[PDB]
Design an enzyme around this catalytic site. Structure first.
Site, PDB file in Angstrom:
ATOM      1  N   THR A 253       0.293  60.287 -27.653  1.00 11.23           N
ATOM      2  CA  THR A 253      -0.750  59.348 -27.250  1.00 11.23           C
ATOM      3  C   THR A 253      -1.956  59.522 -28.154  1.00 11.23           C
ATOM      4  O   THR A 253      -2.212  60.638 -28.657  1.00 11.23           O
ATOM      5  CB  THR A 253      -1.201  59.538 -25.760  1.00 11.23           C
ATOM      6  OG1 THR A 253      -2.305  58.649 -25.437  1.00 11.23           O
ATOM      7  CG2 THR A 253      -1.616  60.970 -25.499  1.00 11.23           C
TER       8      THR A 253
ATOM      9  N   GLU B   6      -4.827  59.389 -27.077  1.00 13.38           N
ATOM     10  CA  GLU B   6      -5.698  60.222 -26.308  1.00 13.38           C
ATOM     11  C   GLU B   6      -5.645  61.696 -26.729  1.00 13.38           C
ATOM     12  O   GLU B   6      -6.501  62.434 -26.330  1.00 13.38           O
ATOM     13  CB  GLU B   6      -5.373  60.091 -24.802  1.00 13.38           C
ATOM     14  CG  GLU B   6      -5.918  58.785 -24.164  1.00 13.38           C
ATOM     15  CD  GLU B   6      -6.362  59.020 -22.701  1.00 13.38           C
ATOM     16  OE1 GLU B   6      -7.264  59.943 -22.485  1.00 13.38           O
ATOM     17  OE2 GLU B   6      -5.791  58.305 -21.772  1.00 13.38           O
TER      18      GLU B   6
ATOM     19  N   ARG C  54     -12.002  55.220 -31.712  1.00 12.83           N
ATOM     20  CA  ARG C  54     -10.635  55.644 -31.657  1.00 12.83           C
ATOM     21  C   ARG C  54      -9.858  54.779 -32.645  1.00 12.83           C
ATOM     22  O   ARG C  54      -9.109  53.857 -32.278  1.00 12.83           O
ATOM     23  CB  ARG C  54     -10.071  55.564 -30.250  1.00 12.83           C
ATOM     24  CG  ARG C  54      -8.622  56.135 -30.144  1.00 12.83           C
ATOM     25  CD  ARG C  54      -7.979  55.853 -28.773  1.00 12.83           C
ATOM     26  NE  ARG C  54      -8.540  56.762 -27.805  1.00 12.83           N
ATOM     27  CZ  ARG C  54      -8.715  56.506 -26.513  1.00 12.83           C
ATOM     28  NH1 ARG C  54      -8.369  55.334 -25.967  1.00 12.83           N
ATOM     29  NH2 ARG C  54      -9.275  57.446 -25.760  1.00 12.83           N
TER      30      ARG C  54
END
Lengths: 291, 330, 291, 330, 330, 330
Positions: free
Chosen positions: F117, F119, F292
């Site tokens: 991910t 993340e 991101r």
């Protein structure tokens, strides 16, 4: 004068009401989640923002309180540490309402400890909050007598009444400025911690008067003083002291009298375990006691 | 003959181990979590102490079943208040953990000598409780005191079924208030000693009152451990294989007394005892299954056994030893 | 006259006190384990045996009650069925104190249901206990008005006051013998069951007045009327009714007004989930509401 | 609401599935090794047939417990001769395999609706067998017919204990001679249909005699499946959660008859039937627990239920359907 | 109070066992594969040596968890080169095998006192590493030195989760360079002794050089074992249950030194020592996370503890004991 | 080439299956508990639907790993509120159950293509998140939102270790806000579709407001599924084995927008749409990791891939399909 208030319980409610009656602008109230009045409900009803964080000693709260720009901070029976980074935000200082004749009985549950120790007097003290908890200089102190038949709840109401009387005149006095405070003498201070279940355990080798005071100290709505009949816990809700047997032994079952280290304690009402409250004579039968 | 006693650190373990070590052809493996009750056999060449706990160990107990020839599982909670205060633990230990041991015996084709309980008969109305003929009577499910009785009974039935279907060699025994020296503590999870006499002797020792639940008119039979252990020893010997698949009450049906009478007998023996003055005055009788008498025909038939010790000698001997071994500083 | 009493809550306490003041000999009190007074504590204090079995409809209790030989039995807010095998033990009969104008509102929680339904009156009724629950003939009934601003707790105190007034004169009347009772007309009876959490769920398509009554019916110390903002539960502790939008939609956030099927409901105070009580405007922000 | 029926291919499975599919919020998972008894639901969008056998499968049943919300285990042998001819298999299936399913419900926090049995009361002397108050009476261990009764009772107690200790949500139900269309075969290991009426109808169908064991004076109660299934459906609905932890007899106590009278009623309904001529002449009555009447207060209280169908309409309807569906070429 | 120390044969095991045996209410079960470091407690009545290895044993460790009340797992590899030379073994032992022990505590509802590590903070930029507020900073996955730090951190989080969700009673502790007598060997897989001081003392003892990685300007805090063990002892005592769910740094933040300064302090204490002449001349300083200072507010609050021994007395005492116990023939 | 997709009943499953079935040498095994999202492939000769659930099944999944050549585990909860509301379930499913599948691949020497991910980078300060060089930054343990990020990262490290030590063939991929037709439902436990665009489109569809958490100034990159799936398809093809042991960000770094801007773009495309009138008026923007952006050098190198679709065409196509397939009666 604007203020941020930390409050809980009946003392918290009456302190908020007194500030409002004295013309203070309460920007926010900090309290706790749970027979006494609810500070949150009072705040919600008066339209005052209210917060109940478990711990305010963190920059998130310092900043939130700083943004409220209190001139003064009050603590009325708030139960947690409010660290200096918060208290120093108020130029006029921070004041705490404590239920004892400070410097005696600093700390927790002064209402109960003064009864446990058989004091004949106690009182309410409004004092400046300094680095050391409950040790700041006294703005005013009001004494009340403790009657032989007072128990925790009746003494609690007397303390609240004294607090109302004290705040009614001292809050306006603070609004006018700094008051010459009375220093607490450390050599005369006493401090008590939070009471554990063990602190209400009746030990029969003690004087009946001391045990009687313990019963008074935690009588309903408090948890009650307790002991065991072998392995069976029982609670003594109300008692009477009486003027030659092993301590803890049953002198009589109706009335239920227990021999103590000195004198005897009559169990007027009590309960076995989580059972219902009953007269001592019935409790004796319930517990299987005999003379 | 390798005899595996699970829960050896107690009354039956002590008296059984003494008996088997008198004979030259026994090796006793005494499994327990402590050894204080049997510490004088620890150095005996034919006694073997085994560290263990039937709720914790799987393989270690299994091993010792395989290693041995006959197995006596004596670990169980039979404390009445526990049936209602901690029923799940009574069930788990007394039923589930003992069932594992039973299945180890089945698997390794070992003989099991299992302590059933006199509580299995429940409220049976026969005057003499008969292992082969008496109906078993318990209360509704809303009377939880019966969980112990019914757990033990179902275990008997499971043993019986393994016997029928899987060739398990078993004998079941039912002790009726065995008593003598070295009684189990009241809360030890070990079968065998009369909880009623231990409690009463404890009352006298502590100076607490003797509780007569509804006047203490319920009648019980009491058995000297010399008689009881003799019977159990014969079950172990199993002359002629006459104990195979049998259920055997072991008690003395002539030693019958209500709790009240047992009370008075103990008190008389107590007041007469030379060490009585180390103990408090009598706190008194306190008013707060009506009969439980064994048939012993099975023991007569299988063991050629009958009890030899009268009520009074067992009472006196049991009390005497208890008092003499009490630690007076503690 | 000797009696066995089944009692709980404030009504139970005042009923016991009234029996005692009327000269009745209370042999035993049956109650329940748990803001109101404790019947057990009152019994324990007055030296009256007290029992709190979960269920008395069993021969064990029939026999215990029979041994007490009551002349009459009283039920004052006892919450469980007392079957006829018990009630028939009293030659003078059994009487129950019910908080409504019977035959209306038989059953559970009449205090709350009369507010839910917007009644303008309610009352207390003392009636004979017959086979059919809450249907026995009426000894006396005393009506009280319900004010628009009454909520459950204020109405509760009014009902208790009416009960005290009613019992003070009817208990001595019963002591003198049978009273010509007033039959309840079944065709006029209504019965309510125990309230579930669903019964305090606010449905915005309803009239604001009906929702307002629901808020009043279960206001603090009761659980509160509730709804959801999407998946977030919130409780409306106090409200106000106001005289063209989807029901449930936010009309304004300060004050917080919610459109209803008819009219609007202002959420004066409430809380989000198990959070603290706050003014409606703050609750709106807490819930992320916007006009 | 996902309802898992284990042993769906039978009487209860059929009638329960019909009932739940009438309602729009049920998904029925019907587990069995065959589907002939329910083949008309196989195409229903809210019925899901699941291949399985509770003695063979572990993980597959476990899965379906997790997937579902409520579980009804209907697999058990309740054929009396089997209690004595194949007791171990009765025990293994009825007790051990159902215990696994119970433990799956405990583990995944699912509700279980478990068929206890009216046989649990045994020789109870109350006139009305009461789930909450009646004592349970069985014979000695040497009367092996009681193995079924006692296995089922111990299972109830184990369910009860999981409920008390582990938060299992359960309702126990006890059917009393449910009867109607689509009766189980006499040797199907599925709970629910009156074995006494199936046997008798079979006697008439086959032209064998009706056995009156000791004159057939023992009295039984009989319950139409429309009444029974209505009750079971309400247990599933569980209005107010009023069935939680409850034990509920489901029977019609006014439909009482001795086997003799049941015999005569069936015979009368038979001789009157338009298809009677396809069946042999009556072979006759043959002389070869005395009462079993349920208390239904729990069903009254929890379900607001009472039975609506008289003896005669249930008898007639049950017989009529049986005769009409008999295959006359086989 | 039965205290189970896994990996007792080392520094913490020794000093902790000494402390607990001073007090009259501790039974210490010291599990390890050897006993040379603690051989003087083997005969103590309240010490119990347990043979074991947390990578080999399953049931034996599980048993001892059940038997005991509180558990201290001290087995872990914290040798930096090993993080890169044998990362899988560091992970398997430090993470996987300790996780099993954690789950035994969860299962038997025992208290666990777990050695987290000061390495969890990594490159945290706070001046004082705070258990409750400091962010944890590690490098990319291509910097494998961080596998130890992150394994230990994930273990903390798993303990935390068991605490939140499963009622596990825990305290986590983080030692900062504890030092004193009876230091672990550098390659012993037992937590507790400062690897930095052991290495340096070893350099002096062997006559090898002291490596200052990039000048040795990285700063560390050093803690006398008398202070450290006092804190750990208070965590065991758990007055007021104030340690429940807490994470507690145990170090002396005033005992701060760069490796260079620690070097010079040791060397000064060494050159002054009466046994220095048994050791080679000083081979010299050799140039080849910048700060790691604990916050100790949690220890202040929970334990009422603060460190009492200055840098110089701990250095001197640690060195003195090491030199005196060196075997000069080997 | 047998491709096993676990969690096929969703966005990636749909688009991947379409792509692989275009090519003549793929057999797709699509494992899931439902098939509504892919029902149009059920009849395809080279698609094979497999009933399953990675939390329930052990052996069935294991089998299908053995049967197949390459495995894509797409089952995970990545719903942010769930990280804090149901952290244990996020951990159990996303970490523990996927770890089992990883170990099946290790055991049967199969290739795994695993969705890591974006993340994992957390609060990394690099402008371009680089799989091989960027440090991973998370908050303290008292910020539980990071449990998802750190669970996924530890899983990557475990995969990496199996690769190093046990010869596991893997590729890890990190999707950055893939979007297009057939988006997963917001609470489906299947990886792949941008939760941020699904939420926003949902706001417009429902007439709820668009939440700009702190003004919605946090910047994200968005990737058309045609670009994303092309990359994933090339990872499957693995030309030259160039993806072995690689970690590959798959996103379009030029499709950067704050949530605010993404908001306005969607709204513009919405207001312009011919079916807009079936949806409520715009409820408005509501003020309530800052960047991101992926490095895609690894995808450039290994896959020869670069994204071809501009922000506006992906937005328009994604919205258009969503609106057109909404059921307006429900």
């Amino acid at each position: 004068m604007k203020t941020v208030v930390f409050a809980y319980h009946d003392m918290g409610c009456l302190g908020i009401e007194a500030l409002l009656a004295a013309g203070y602008e309460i920007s926010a109230i900090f309290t706790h989640t749970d027979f006494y009045g609810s500070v949150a409900r009072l705040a919600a009803e008066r339209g005052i923002p209210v917060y109940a964080p478990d711990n305010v000693n963190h920059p998130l709260w310092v900043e939130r309180i700083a943004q409220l720009s209190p001139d003064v901070i009050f603590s009325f029976y708030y139960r947690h540490l409010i660290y200096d980074e918060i208290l120093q935000l108020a130029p006029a200082g921070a004041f705490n309402l404590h239920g004892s004749l400070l410097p005696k009985y600093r700390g927790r549950a002064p209402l109960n400890w003064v009864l446990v120790n058989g004091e004949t007097e106690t009182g309410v003290t409004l004092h400046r909050m300094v680095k050391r908890a409950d040790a700041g200089a006294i703005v005013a102190q009001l004494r009340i007598a403790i009657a032989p038949d007072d128990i925790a709840i009746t003494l609690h109401h007397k303390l609240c009444h004294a607090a109302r009387q004290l705040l009614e005149q001292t809050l306006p006095a603070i609004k006018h400025g700094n008051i010459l405070e009375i220093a607490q003498r450390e050599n005369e201070a006493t401090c008590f911690g939070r009471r554990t279940p063990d602190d209400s355990f009746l030990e029969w080798h003690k004087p009946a008067s001391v045990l009687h005071n313990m019963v008074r100290a935690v009588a309903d709505p408090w948890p009650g003083a307790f002991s065991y009949v072998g392995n069976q816990k029982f609670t003594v809700w109300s008692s009477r002291v009486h003027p030659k047997a092993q301590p803890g032994s049953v002198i009589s079952v109706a009335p239920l009298l227990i021999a103590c280290g000195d004198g005897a304690l009559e169990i007027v009402t009590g309960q076995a375990g989580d059972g219902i409250t009953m007269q001592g004579s019935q409790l004796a039968q319930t517990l299987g006691l005999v003379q | 003959m390798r005899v595996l006693i699970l829960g050896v650190n107690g009354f039956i373990g002590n008296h059984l181990t003494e008996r088997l070590l008198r004979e030259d052809h026994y090796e006793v493996y005494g499994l327990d979590i402590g050894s204080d009750a049997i510490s004088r056999f620890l150095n005996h060449p034919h006694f073997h102490f085994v560290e263990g706990d039937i709720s914790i160990h799987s393989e270690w107990i299994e091993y010792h079943v395989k290693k041995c020839d006959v197995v006596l599982p004596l670990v169980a909670i039979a404390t009445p208040i526990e049936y209602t205060r901690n029923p799940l633990r009574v069930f788990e230990l007394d039923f589930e953990e003992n069932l594992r041991i039973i299945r180890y015996c089945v698997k390794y084709r070992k003989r099991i000598i299992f302590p059933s309980t006199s509580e299995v008969y429940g409220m049976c109305s026969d005057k003499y409780f008969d292992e082969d003929h008496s109906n078993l009577i318990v209360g509704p499910v809303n009377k939880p005191r019966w969980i112990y009785s019914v757990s033990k009974q179902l275990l008997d039935r499971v043993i019986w079924a393994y016997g029928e279907k899987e060739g398990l060699q078993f004998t079941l025994f039912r002790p009726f208030n065995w008593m003598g020296p070295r009684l189990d503590n009241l809360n030890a999870a070990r079968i065998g000693s009369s909880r009623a006499i231990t409690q009463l002797i404890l009352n006298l020792v502590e100076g607490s009152p003797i509780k007569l639940i509804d006047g203490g008119k319920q009648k019980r039979c009491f058995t000297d451990i010399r008689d009881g252990i003799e019977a159990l020893y014969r079950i172990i010997e199993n002359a002629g294989n006459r104990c195979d698949g049998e259920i055997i009450n072991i008690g003395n049906p002539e030693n019958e007394a209500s709790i009240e009478e047992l009370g008075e007998m103990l008190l008389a023996s107590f007041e007469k005892h030379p060490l009585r003055h180390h103990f408090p005055p009598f706190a008194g009788f306190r008013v707060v299954v009506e009969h439980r008498k064994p048939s012993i025909r099975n023991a007569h038939r299988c063991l050629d056994w009958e009890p030899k010790i009268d009520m009074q000698e067992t009472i006196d001997e049991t009390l005497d030893f208890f008092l003499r071994t009490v630690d007076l500083t503690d």
